[PDB]
Design an enzyme around this catalytic site. Structure first.
Site, PDB file in Angstrom:
ATOM      1  N   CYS A 149      64.764  39.936 109.806  1.00 40.96           N
ATOM      2  CA  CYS A 149      63.737  40.070 109.255  1.00 40.96           C
ATOM      3  C   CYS A 149      62.494  41.213 109.328  1.00 40.96           C
ATOM      4  N   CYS A 154      62.771  40.672 105.724  1.00 40.64           N
ATOM      5  CA  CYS A 154      61.522  39.991 104.845  1.00 40.64           C
ATOM      6  C   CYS A 154      60.503  41.121 104.731  1.00 40.64           C
ATOM      7  N   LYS A 157      60.900  44.740 103.141  1.00 40.22           N
ATOM      8  CA  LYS A 157      61.402  44.433 100.991  1.00 40.22           C
ATOM      9  C   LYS A 157      59.987  43.830 100.650  1.00 40.22           C
ATOM     10  N   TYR A 291      70.081  37.219  95.923  1.00 44.43           N
ATOM     11  CA  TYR A 291      68.465  37.200  95.866  1.00 44.43           C
ATOM     12  C   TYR A 291      68.156  38.666  96.358  1.00 44.43           C
ATOM     13  N   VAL A 292      68.881  39.372  97.290  1.00 45.53           N
ATOM     14  CA  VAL A 292      68.707  40.240  98.104  1.00 45.53           C
ATOM     15  C   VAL A 292      68.954  41.522  96.805  1.00 45.53           C
ATOM     16  N   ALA A 293      70.344  41.169  95.845  1.00 45.61           N
ATOM     17  CA  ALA A 293      71.077  42.378  95.588  1.00 45.61           C
ATOM     18  C   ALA A 293      69.102  42.583  94.002  1.00 45.61           C
ATOM     19  N   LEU A 294      68.602  41.870  93.994  1.00 45.66           N
ATOM     20  CA  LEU A 294      68.179  41.622  92.818  1.00 45.66           C
ATOM     21  C   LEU A 294      66.910  42.468  93.291  1.00 45.66           C
ATOM     22  N   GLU A 295      66.174  41.609  94.260  1.00 46.84           N
ATOM     23  CA  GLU A 295      65.029  42.378  95.114  1.00 46.84           C
ATOM     24  C   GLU A 295      64.625  43.495  95.422  1.00 46.84           C
ATOM     25  N   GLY A 387      77.178  39.191 100.162  1.00 48.22           N
ATOM     26  CA  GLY A 387      77.154  38.631 100.918  1.00 48.22           C
ATOM     27  C   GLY A 387      76.641  39.272 102.670  1.00 48.22           C
ATOM     28  N   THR A 437      63.667  32.926 107.713  1.00 58.07           N
ATOM     29  CA  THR A 437      62.967  32.777 108.396  1.00 58.07           C
ATOM     30  C   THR A 437      62.469  31.835 109.192  1.00 58.07           C
ATOM     31  N   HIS A 566      39.455  26.283  88.359  1.00 62.49           N
ATOM     32  CA  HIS A 566      39.931  26.761  87.194  1.00 62.49           C
ATOM     33  C   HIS A 566      39.258  28.394  87.377  1.00 62.49           C
ATOM     34  N   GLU A 571      46.965  25.929  88.093  1.00 68.93           N
ATOM     35  CA  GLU A 571      46.644  24.579  87.654  1.00 68.93           C
ATOM     36  C   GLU A 571      47.306  24.153  86.961  1.00 68.93           C
TER      37      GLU A 571
HETATM   38  C1  LIG Z   1      67.610  41.982 102.698  1.00 66.16           C
HETATM   39  C2  LIG Z   1      67.034  40.678 104.104  1.00 66.16           C
HETATM   40  C3  LIG Z   1      65.823  40.087 102.968  1.00 66.16           C
HETATM   41  C4  LIG Z   1      65.178  38.726 103.620  1.00 66.16           C
HETATM   42  N1  LIG Z   1      64.132  38.015 103.305  1.00 66.16           N
HETATM   43  C5  LIG Z   1      63.626  36.846 103.304  1.00 66.16           C
HETATM   44  C6  LIG Z   1      62.418  36.809 103.216  1.00 66.16           C
HETATM   45  O1  LIG Z   1      62.272  37.215 102.620  1.00 66.16           O
HETATM   46  N2  LIG Z   1      61.973  35.341 103.750  1.00 66.16           N
HETATM   47  C7  LIG Z   1      62.831  34.641 104.194  1.00 66.16           C
HETATM   48  O2  LIG Z   1      62.279  33.240 105.105  1.00 66.16           O
HETATM   49  N3  LIG Z   1      64.281  35.465 104.961  1.00 66.16           N
HETATM   50  C8  LIG Z   1      64.383  36.009 104.501  1.00 66.16           C
HETATM   51  N4  LIG Z   1      65.696  36.905 104.745  1.00 66.16           N
HETATM   52  C9  LIG Z   1      66.191  36.011 105.816  1.00 66.16           C
HETATM   53  C10 LIG Z   1      65.501  35.812 107.583  1.00 66.16           C
HETATM   54  O3  LIG Z   1      66.026  37.579 107.721  1.00 66.16           O
HETATM   55  C11 LIG Z   1      67.036  35.027 108.842  1.00 66.16           C
HETATM   56  O4  LIG Z   1      67.204  34.098 107.526  1.00 66.16           O
HETATM   57  C12 LIG Z   1      66.143  35.119 109.831  1.00 66.16           C
HETATM   58  O5  LIG Z   1      66.565  36.296 110.343  1.00 66.16           O
HETATM   59  C13 LIG Z   1      67.238  34.848 110.602  1.00 66.16           C
HETATM   60  O6  LIG Z   1      67.132  35.025 112.000  1.00 66.16           O
HETATM   61  P1  LIG Z   1      68.077  34.477 113.715  1.00 66.16           P
HETATM   62  O7  LIG Z   1      66.784  34.296 114.287  1.00 66.16           O
HETATM   63  O8  LIG Z   1      69.096  33.048 113.125  1.00 66.16           O
HETATM   64  O9  LIG Z   1      68.695  35.932 113.135  1.00 66.16           O
HETATM   65  P2  LIG Z   1      68.617  37.698 113.161  1.00 66.16           P
HETATM   66  O10 LIG Z   1      66.891  37.408 112.982  1.00 66.16           O
HETATM   67  O11 LIG Z   1      69.508  38.334 112.611  1.00 66.16           O
HETATM   68  O12 LIG Z   1      68.772  37.999 114.885  1.00 66.16           O
HETATM   69  C14 LIG Z   1      69.849  38.677 115.323  1.00 66.16           C
HETATM   70  C15 LIG Z   1      69.697  39.167 116.392  1.00 66.16           C
HETATM   71  O13 LIG Z   1      70.753  39.025 117.662  1.00 66.16           O
HETATM   72  C16 LIG Z   1      70.896  40.100 117.818  1.00 66.16           C
HETATM   73  N5  LIG Z   1      72.639  40.456 117.815  1.00 66.16           N
HETATM   74  C17 LIG Z   1      73.698  39.722 117.913  1.00 66.16           C
HETATM   75  N6  LIG Z   1      74.533  39.793 117.937  1.00 66.16           N
HETATM   76  C18 LIG Z   1      74.403  40.195 119.976  1.00 66.16           C
HETATM   77  C19 LIG Z   1      75.241  40.364 120.359  1.00 66.16           C
HETATM   78  N7  LIG Z   1      76.492  39.600 121.058  1.00 66.16           N
HETATM   79  N8  LIG Z   1      74.058  40.371 121.775  1.00 66.16           N
HETATM   80  C20 LIG Z   1      72.880  40.161 121.569  1.00 66.16           C
HETATM   81  N9  LIG Z   1      71.943  40.642 120.547  1.00 66.16           N
HETATM   82  C21 LIG Z   1      72.936  40.312 119.534  1.00 66.16           C
HETATM   83  C22 LIG Z   1      71.265  40.932 116.672  1.00 66.16           C
HETATM   84  O14 LIG Z   1      71.626  42.743 115.731  1.00 66.16           O
HETATM   85  C23 LIG Z   1      70.175  40.447 115.644  1.00 66.16           C
HETATM   86  O15 LIG Z   1      69.273  41.433 116.462  1.00 66.16           O
HETATM   87  C24 LIG Z   1      65.536  37.874 103.979  1.00 66.16           C
HETATM   88  C25 LIG Z   1      67.422  38.772 104.234  1.00 66.16           C
HETATM   89  C26 LIG Z   1      67.428  39.566 104.533  1.00 66.16           C
HETATM   90  C27 LIG Z   1      68.445  40.376 104.930  1.00 66.16           C
HETATM   91  C1  LIG Z   2      28.614  31.827  85.976  1.00 63.38           C
HETATM   92  C2  LIG Z   2      29.838  30.397  86.074  1.00 63.38           C
HETATM   93  C3  LIG Z   2      30.418  30.704  86.476  1.00 63.38           C
HETATM   94  C4  LIG Z   2      31.394  29.645  86.041  1.00 63.38           C
HETATM   95  N1  LIG Z   2      32.615  29.321  86.770  1.00 63.38           N
HETATM   96  C5  LIG Z   2      33.181  28.578  86.843  1.00 63.38           C
HETATM   97  C6  LIG Z   2      34.994  28.444  87.822  1.00 63.38           C
HETATM   98  O1  LIG Z   2      35.484  29.577  87.849  1.00 63.38           O
HETATM   99  N2  LIG Z   2      34.913  27.340  87.589  1.00 63.38           N
HETATM  100  C7  LIG Z   2      34.633  26.266  87.105  1.00 63.38           C
HETATM  101  O2  LIG Z   2      35.553  25.052  87.052  1.00 63.38           O
HETATM  102  N3  LIG Z   2      33.316  25.994  86.235  1.00 63.38           N
HETATM  103  C8  LIG Z   2      33.058  27.297  86.761  1.00 63.38           C
HETATM  104  N4  LIG Z   2      31.324  27.178  86.303  1.00 63.38           N
HETATM  105  C9  LIG Z   2      30.580  25.932  85.434  1.00 63.38           C
HETATM  106  C10 LIG Z   2      31.932  25.396  84.029  1.00 63.38           C
HETATM  107  O3  LIG Z   2      31.223  26.554  82.837  1.00 63.38           O
HETATM  108  C11 LIG Z   2      30.967  24.504  83.812  1.00 63.38           C
HETATM  109  O4  LIG Z   2      31.094  23.027  84.828  1.00 63.38           O
HETATM  110  C12 LIG Z   2      31.825  23.733  82.350  1.00 63.38           C
HETATM  111  O5  LIG Z   2      30.915  24.949  81.310  1.00 63.38           O
HETATM  112  C13 LIG Z   2      30.853  22.400  81.498  1.00 63.38           C
HETATM  113  O6  LIG Z   2      31.244  21.657  80.661  1.00 63.38           O
HETATM  114  P1  LIG Z   2      30.350  20.947  79.683  1.00 63.38           P
HETATM  115  O7  LIG Z   2      31.516  20.763  78.525  1.00 63.38           O
HETATM  116  O8  LIG Z   2      29.412  20.051  80.574  1.00 63.38           O
HETATM  117  O9  LIG Z   2      29.352  22.415  78.729  1.00 63.38           O
HETATM  118  P2  LIG Z   2      29.367  23.260  78.128  1.00 63.38           P
HETATM  119  O10 LIG Z   2      30.566  23.781  78.467  1.00 63.38           O
HETATM  120  O11 LIG Z   2      28.205  23.766  78.504  1.00 63.38           O
HETATM  121  O12 LIG Z   2      29.341  23.182  77.121  1.00 63.38           O
HETATM  122  C14 LIG Z   2      27.928  22.327  76.011  1.00 63.38           C
HETATM  123  C15 LIG Z   2      27.312  22.784  74.835  1.00 63.38           C
HETATM  124  O13 LIG Z   2      26.865  22.014  74.258  1.00 63.38           O
HETATM  125  C16 LIG Z   2      26.230  23.205  72.828  1.00 63.38           C
HETATM  126  N5  LIG Z   2      24.455  22.477  73.100  1.00 63.38           N
HETATM  127  C17 LIG Z   2      23.546  22.453  73.708  1.00 63.38           C
HETATM  128  N6  LIG Z   2      22.742  21.627  73.897  1.00 63.38           N
HETATM  129  C18 LIG Z   2      23.235  20.480  71.621  1.00 63.38           C
HETATM  130  C19 LIG Z   2      22.214  19.865  71.279  1.00 63.38           C
HETATM  131  N7  LIG Z   2      21.351  19.500  70.790  1.00 63.38           N
HETATM  132  N8  LIG Z   2      23.670  20.081  69.834  1.00 63.38           N
HETATM  133  C20 LIG Z   2      24.738  20.206  70.078  1.00 63.38           C
HETATM  134  N9  LIG Z   2      25.550  21.485  71.080  1.00 63.38           N
HETATM  135  C21 LIG Z   2      23.846  21.232  71.793  1.00 63.38           C
HETATM  136  C22 LIG Z   2      26.016  24.242  74.683  1.00 63.38           C
HETATM  137  O14 LIG Z   2      24.915  25.218  74.215  1.00 63.38           O
HETATM  138  C23 LIG Z   2      27.520  24.683  74.872  1.00 63.38           C
HETATM  139  O15 LIG Z   2      27.695  25.291  73.742  1.00 63.38           O
HETATM  140  C24 LIG Z   2      30.731  28.210  86.277  1.00 63.38           C
HETATM  141  C25 LIG Z   2      30.099  28.336  85.133  1.00 63.38           C
HETATM  142  C26 LIG Z   2      28.753  29.614  85.347  1.00 63.38           C
HETATM  143  C27 LIG Z   2      27.523  29.645  85.126  1.00 63.38           C
HETATM  144  C1  LIG Z   3      65.047  32.437  99.296  1.00 59.51           C
HETATM  145  C2  LIG Z   3      66.156  31.632 100.330  1.00 59.51           C
HETATM  146  C3  LIG Z   3      67.500  31.512 101.147  1.00 59.51           C
HETATM  147  C4  LIG Z   3      68.310  30.334 100.843  1.00 59.51           C
HETATM  148  C5  LIG Z   3      69.310  30.510 102.145  1.00 59.51           C
HETATM  149  O1  LIG Z   3      68.617  30.788 102.770  1.00 59.51           O
HETATM  150  N1  LIG Z   3      70.147  28.577 102.188  1.00 59.51           N
HETATM  151  N2  LIG Z   3      70.468  28.451 101.294  1.00 59.51           N
HETATM  152  C6  LIG Z   3      71.085  26.715 101.448  1.00 59.51           C
HETATM  153  C7  LIG Z   3      70.119  25.907 101.487  1.00 59.51           C
HETATM  154  C8  LIG Z   3      70.647  24.567 101.853  1.00 59.51           C
HETATM  155  C9  LIG Z   3      71.347  24.123 102.617  1.00 59.51           C
HETATM  156  C10 LIG Z   3      72.434  25.663 103.358  1.00 59.51           C
HETATM  157  C11 LIG Z   3      71.848  26.559 102.994  1.00 59.51           C
HETATM  158  F1  LIG Z   3      73.093  27.639 103.213  1.00 59.51           F
HETATM  159  N3  LIG Z   3      68.059  29.812  99.516  1.00 59.51           N
HETATM  160  O2  LIG Z   3      66.469  30.961  99.259  1.00 59.51           O
END
Ligand SMILES: Cc1cc2nc3c(=O)[nH]c(=O)nc-3n(C[C@H](O)[C@H](O)[C@H](O)COP(=O)(O)OP(=O)(O)OC[C@H]3O[C@@H](n4cnc5c(N)ncnc54)[C@H](O)[C@@H]3O)c2cc1C
Ligand SMILES: Cc1cc2nc3c(=O)[nH]c(=O)nc-3n(C[C@H](O)[C@H](O)[C@H](O)COP(=O)(O)OP(=O)(O)OC[C@H]3O[C@@H](n4cnc5c(N)ncnc54)[C@H](O)[C@@H]3O)c2cc1C
Ligand SMILES: Cc1cc(C(=O)NNc2ccccc2F)no1
Ligand SMILES: Cc1cc(C(=O)NNc2ccccc2F)no1
Ligand SMILES: Cc1cc(C(=O)NNc2ccccc2F)no1
Lengths: 588, 588
Positions: A149, A154, A157, A291-295, A387, A437, A566, A571
């Site tokens: 990894c 991981c 990549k 997943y390795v190929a496509l990533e 594989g 990992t 929101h 959501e």
């Molecule tokens: C391209 C790629 C992308 C991946 N992306 C993800 C991801 O995004 N998320 C995720 O969760 N997992 C990902 N994985 C999987 C993750 O890498 C493995 O699941 C994880 O590394 C397994 O850990 P491990 O401890 O089993 O072995 P490893 O991390 O492979 O470690 C084993 C180590 O032991 C060493 N070793 C081997 N034989 C001996 C020996 N005889 N004596 C001493 N040392 C030895 C090896 O060289 C290696 O250093 C990815 C894998 C690959 C190949």
């Molecule tokens: C700058 C800002 C950012 C925000 N960001 C977020 C956010 O990221 N996430 C989030 O969840 N909430 C956010 N909010 C809050 C969210 O906008 C409000 O909770 C939501 O709009 C409330 O809805 P409401 O139906 O109570 O009223 P409103 O949406 O205010 O609707 C009331 C409507 O009734 C009209 N009205 C009033 N009096 C009358 C009347 N007498 N006759 C007819 N129509 C009338 C008004 O003009 C208005 O059009 C934000 C608010 C502000 C000010």
């Molecule tokens: C990104 C990613 C990696 C895997 C994976 O590691 N292994 N699949 C697996 C699942 C359950 C039991 C036994 C297995 F071998 N799946 O998705």
């Protein structure tokens, strides 16, 4: 029950103190061990359910029922007065260091699982060694401590994925009012690789520092288990020697496979080579559909490359196939070419890699399509992603008696124990477990605590969430729709689904109905959520929190009563209502 | 029990059919109602556990106990033979349109809650009117259908936040290998506003289309409730008239406050004006410290503005104050200036806004700090963000009898009912409820189903998650740490916490220990998660899924047994271990 736990705990712990939080005699012993730099596990009996029962069981080892009681490797050492006597007489250091073995624990493999297990064991006073060796790839690529990894998985990549995502951020910036012209900007592969490798180097060094500061012995050597307690090591000079250990953890991982065709090993590369490649790959063919190929194909295309993927049958075998097809359709519409129903027959060299001027070679790929037509096209780089496999014949003498399955992975109990009682296996070589990992880390840490601190918690391998980091990301937790239908029957399955559009895609003029999510549910079990699926930006961040709810047994009613945040992509899961059975369209 | 539910359902539904899925006579009535375009609710008695009891109770309304049974506005209409008789004699349409009132439902206010309630009610055959009017701001700004979030809230503010985030994406792209030079790129305010407003206009139009397609009457007029069933309307020509309705939903929202100082109304603006402003604000003072104040200051600074925030006492009063201080520290380190412990006394005009050359004016702001020292500085734009308030004296005659609290909001039961039995209130004017768009939508949809389809489900207002979209985002679900300690005492509270670094920030050379998360837990209740807090990128996507688990009663053990997705920010919640009581550093 209580008697068998105490027995296992005492026989296995390296150094363990039985104590109570309120006892000044215990505090007196604790402070002595801290001054002497003696690390140990501690079991506070006044904080356990049956601490009174354990306190009486201790007398079967020590013939006393009081607290504190100190043990070393299965032997009762003494109460407060006795421990202070050894300390006063300069006899304590020798008593806590005597062992039948060189080490309490030898970890073979220094990757995700092995480093986690070794560091955790050391915290409880286990004398620990971690062995790591990286066998070079066919072209000679090698790397430092940390495993697949950290070095070739991981970490690099996802960093190259981010480099590809930033291409679309540059295009979006114009629509949000910024003055740049995306069409005049290009990418430099070697600048990216240098930054990625500098981060990897800081991780290599950090793990060596971590092992030093936990008093773990790090050996950069190849290990081979020759008997239950003996590990043969071979160093960089081919010096051979033997070290002994009480408990053994196998954690050696896997490496990429090559197909058995002419030219594959000689002229192609794998993901092991890609992440440090000193030249840009150029026009590239990716063979495989994991997943390795496509990533990899995905980020190479976003960096501006000419990329083709050759697919034997289907994409992402084992994943939900509706989701897999949406993943590939997005990639095909955004610059990845696909050679479908096709396999390779041979790789021919036309030019050798120009190692001085830092340029790829040139290859002729010959194959055939499943009907019978021929494939023939020239590529500068060919990447095999077909594989991965362990090679435990390197690691494990067959006379030791550790059972393997027909794929070559280790057959283990639900507490990671092999068919040899002192030997455990974790990570990708443990047969039947998800190969990820965070699974390897949890398995290693939890195992270390059971061996050396009297813990009982096991690792839970069910419903482990995943994310595929394709150009549009795909996160999942639980069953695919087809596996749910096969397990329970179509009439017992209800699927809620919807398209969505990220708010960030509106001003940027991106697509209305490509992002998609669904919940696969079991009608006869209160609409239990069997599987969750999402295709969209930041899919790993979206999915992670829902994995806790699914672990807890979430139903559709739990999603409905929870309120959305929101504006977010996530959501949309809180208001799903269209069912597949209804036939109503899921579009926005 | 059942009989009280049945009487309320029959009395309130506009058109409702009592049915069983297995009955061909019920299918024949359904088919006639669909052919005549008569919308209606349906209750399938064989899908309810007390359906046999319900069927017997129907007889005290109709004198029969069979299905189907059709009702209109509390009156039994007939069984199968009778409904078919009315249809073939062309009598049915007049029967289903008979009403004491002009409408079954009048919604006053066409925003988040009101539009949701009106569309949902119409689906069950309720004859519905939605009234919306937008009183212009002091400088004359107005906008279209959809409410505060759509026009001057969530939607434009998050789009402008995204434009600000793209500034740092342009910087990061250099480190990942792209050829651009961030220091030569600038931002065009009017181009961004044009794109934001074109999206808002598509939402305005989409809502008018949706009401037309649901047969809802949209009136662009100001409404006033003058008795329990009478609404006085005043249109844009100042024509005055009265319409009547059975049920009334108040959904009129709030508007921004101004301080009572000279020059505030004449020369400053609010968020109502900001999102359509035709010129860049220039050098800007934001007065206030709410989430609206900090979100607007944040994106203005990221777009290259010279921004100051004037804070009377603390940031984000009512939010967790450790998290609020981290939010502000990040803004101050990234170019937002703060005038702390300070309030304004007067705004003086130095230049009038230049409407021709499309430029702001110039203002002199005088104020003082709490110790009495003076503040005096010039700004081009002054934005007031000092709270919002309803003004129900404009909406509601005092003689109707609807009770208000000391802040002027409507006092409601847990089913949104006011002190007047046919009048309900939803959204920001409902006293004591979180003031959020998804809360208003859920309340409106769930209420319409109870009024017109016999539903029983209430809205759950507890533990509703939030996100503040500051330059570094802050997501939360549940109690702040100080509220948890006040409710249960310090000895019953345990807090797990950690810093973290996004993988995307490594190659980009961003900060090691600024992002932060914590879980606030209750020791004596199995370590129940009382509150979750995260500061970091994509914090709304991170937080959402955990809101389902908290709704379900998640404990720390549930977080521990769930496995992480790697590499993500959210996975840090699955491995937390450092407690605040231990004193151990949270850095990583
Ligand atoms: C391209 C790629 C992308 C991946 N992306 C993800 C991801 O995004 N998320 C995720 O969760 N997992 C990902 N994985 C999987 C993750 O890498 C493995 O699941 C994880 O590394 C397994 O850990 P491990 O401890 O089993 O072995 P490893 O991390 O492979 O470690 C084993 C180590 O032991 C060493 N070793 C081997 N034989 C001996 C020996 N005889 N004596 C001493 N040392 C030895 C090896 O060289 C290696 O250093 C990815 C894998 C690959 C190949
Ligand atoms: C700058 C800002 C950012 C925000 N960001 C977020 C956010 O990221 N996430 C989030 O969840 N909430 C956010 N909010 C809050 C969210 O906008 C409000 O909770 C939501 O709009 C409330 O809805 P409401 O139906 O109570 O009223 P409103 O949406 O205010 O609707 C009331 C409507 O009734 C009209 N009205 C009033 N009096 C009358 C009347 N007498 N006759 C007819 N129509 C009338 C008004 O003009 C208005 O059009 C934000 C608010 C502000 C000010
Ligand atoms: C990104 C990613 C990696 C895997 C994976 O590691 N292994 N699949 C697996 C699942 C359950 C039991 C036994 C297995 F071998 N799946 O998705
Ligand atoms: C206190 C009060 C009364 C009015 C008033 O007359 N509103 N009618 C109206 C309706 C639609 C567009 C434009 C309008 F003027 N406004 O505030
Ligand atoms: C019971 C309760 C909660 C609230 C409240 O603070 N609502 N608004 C809000 C909170 C957080 C972020 C964004 C927001 F708009 N008022 O009463």
């Amino acid at each position: 029950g209580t008697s068998q736990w105490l027995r296992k705990t005492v026989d296995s712990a390296a150094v363990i103190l039985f104590s109570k939080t309120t006892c000044p005699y215990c505090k007196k012993v604790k402070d002595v061990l801290a001054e002497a730099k003696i690390k140990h596990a501690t079991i506070e009996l006044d904080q356990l359910s049956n601490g009174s029962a354990i306190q009486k069981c201790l007398a079967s080892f020590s013939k006393i029922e009081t607290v504190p009681q100190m043990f070393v490797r299965g032997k009762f050492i003494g109460d407060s007065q006795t421990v202070l006597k050894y300390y006063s007489n300069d006899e304590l250091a020798g008593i806590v260091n005597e062992s039948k073995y060189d080490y309490d624990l030898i970890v073979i493999g220094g990757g995700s699982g092995g480093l986690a297990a070794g560091k955790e064991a050391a915290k409880y006073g286990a004398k620990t060694a971690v062995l790591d060796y990286v066998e070079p790839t066919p072209i000679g690529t090698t790397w430092g401590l940390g495993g697949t990894c950290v070095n070739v998985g991981c970490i690099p990549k996802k960093l190259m994925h981010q480099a590809g995502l930033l291409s679309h951020a540059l295009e979006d910036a114009e629509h949000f009012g910024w003055s740049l012209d995306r069409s005049k900007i290009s990418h430099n592969w070697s600048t990216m690789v240098e930054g990625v490798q500098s981060h990897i180097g800081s991780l290599n060094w950090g793990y060596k520092v971590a092992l030093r500061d936990n008093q773990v012995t790090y050996l950069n050597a190849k290990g081979r288990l020759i008997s239950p307690h003996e590990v043969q090591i071979t160093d960089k000079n081919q010096k051979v020697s033997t070290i002994t250990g009480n408990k053994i953890i196998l954690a050696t991982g896997e490496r990429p496979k090559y197909p058995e065709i002419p030219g594959a090993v000689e002229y192609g590369i794998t993901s092991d080579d890609l992440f440090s490649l000193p030249y840009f790959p150029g026009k590239t063919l990716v063979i495989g559909a994991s997943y390795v190929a496509l990533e990899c194909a995905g980020f190479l295309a976003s960096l501006g490359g000419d990329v083709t993927v050759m697919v034997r049958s289907i994409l992402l075998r084992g994943f939900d196939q509706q989701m897999a097809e949406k993943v590939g359709d997005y990639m095909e519409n955004h610059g990845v070419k696909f050679a479908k129903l096709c396999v390779p027959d041979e790789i021919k060299q036309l030019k050798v890699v120009d190692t001085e001027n830092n340029k790829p070679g040139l290859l002729l790929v010959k194959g055939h399509y499943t009907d019978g037509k021929k494939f023939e096209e020239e590529f500068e780089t060919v990447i095999f992603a077909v594989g991965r496999e362990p090679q435990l014949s390197k690691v494990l003498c067959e006379t030791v008696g550790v059972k393997l399955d027909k794929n070559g992975r280790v057959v283990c109990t639900d507490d990671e124990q092999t068919t040899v009682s002192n030997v455990y296996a974790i990570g990708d070589i443990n047969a039947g477990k998800p190969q990820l990992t965070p699974v390897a880390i949890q398995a290693g840490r939890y195992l270390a605590r059971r061996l050396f601190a009297g813990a009982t918690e096991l690792t839970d391998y069910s419903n482990v969430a995943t994310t595929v980091f394709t150009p549009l990301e795909y996160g999942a937790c639980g069953l695919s729709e087809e596996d749910a239908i096969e397990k329970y029957g179509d009439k017992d399955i209800e699927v809620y689904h919807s398209n969505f559009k990220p708010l960030e895609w509106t001003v940027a003029h991106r697509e209305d109905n490509v992002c998609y999510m669904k919940l696969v549910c079991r009608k006869s079990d209160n609409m239990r959520v069997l599987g969750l699926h999402v295709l969209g930006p930041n899919a790993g961040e979206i999915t992670q929190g829902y994995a806790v709810a699914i672990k807890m047994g979430a139903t559709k009613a739990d999603f409905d009563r929870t309120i959305g945040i929101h504006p977010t992509c996530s959501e949309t899961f809180t208001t799903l209502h269209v069912t597949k059975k209804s036939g109503v369209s899921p579009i926005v």
